[PDB]
Swiss-Prot record:
Residues annotated as signal peptide: none
Pfam families: Rubredoxin
Keywords from the UniProt entry: Electron transport, Iron, Metal-binding, Transport
Comment on bound cofactor: Binds 1 Fe(3+) ion per subunit.
Source organism: Pyrococcus furiosus (strain ATCC 43587 / DSM 3638 / JCM 8422 / Vc1)
Gene3D superfamilies to which the protein is assigned, alphabetical: 2.20.28.10
Temperature curve summary: Extremely thermostable, being unaffected after incubation for 24 hours at 95 degrees Celsius.
An annotated GO BP: alkane catabolic process
Biological function: Rubredoxin is a small nonheme, iron protein lacking acid-labile sulfide. Its single Fe, chelated to 4 Cys, functions as an electron acceptor and may also stabilize the conformation of the molecule.
GO molecular function, one term: electron transfer activity
Protein name (Swiss-Prot/TrEMBL): Rubredoxin
Family under the similarity heading: Belongs to the rubredoxin family.
Cofactors: Fe(3+)
């Protein structure tokens, strides 16, 4: 699945990993993260992530 970078801090939202400590099961696509999910490292909103693909 896809990976996304937090443009602020460099955290990778890896769809295969999810974010279980913050309520997101492995395999959750970035689009399906709740609108108010934030980077678990720096707190940036979803808008600040960039999909790692051409
Ligand atoms: Fe971040
Ligand atoms: Na959405």
């Amino acid at each position: 699945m896809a990976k996304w970078v937090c443009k602020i801090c460099g955290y990778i939202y890896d769809e295969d990993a999810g974010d279980p400590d913050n309520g997101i099961s492995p395999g959750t696509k970035f689009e399906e993260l709740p609108d108010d999910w934030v980077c678990p490292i720096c707190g940036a909103p979803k808008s600040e992530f960039e999909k790692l693909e051409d």
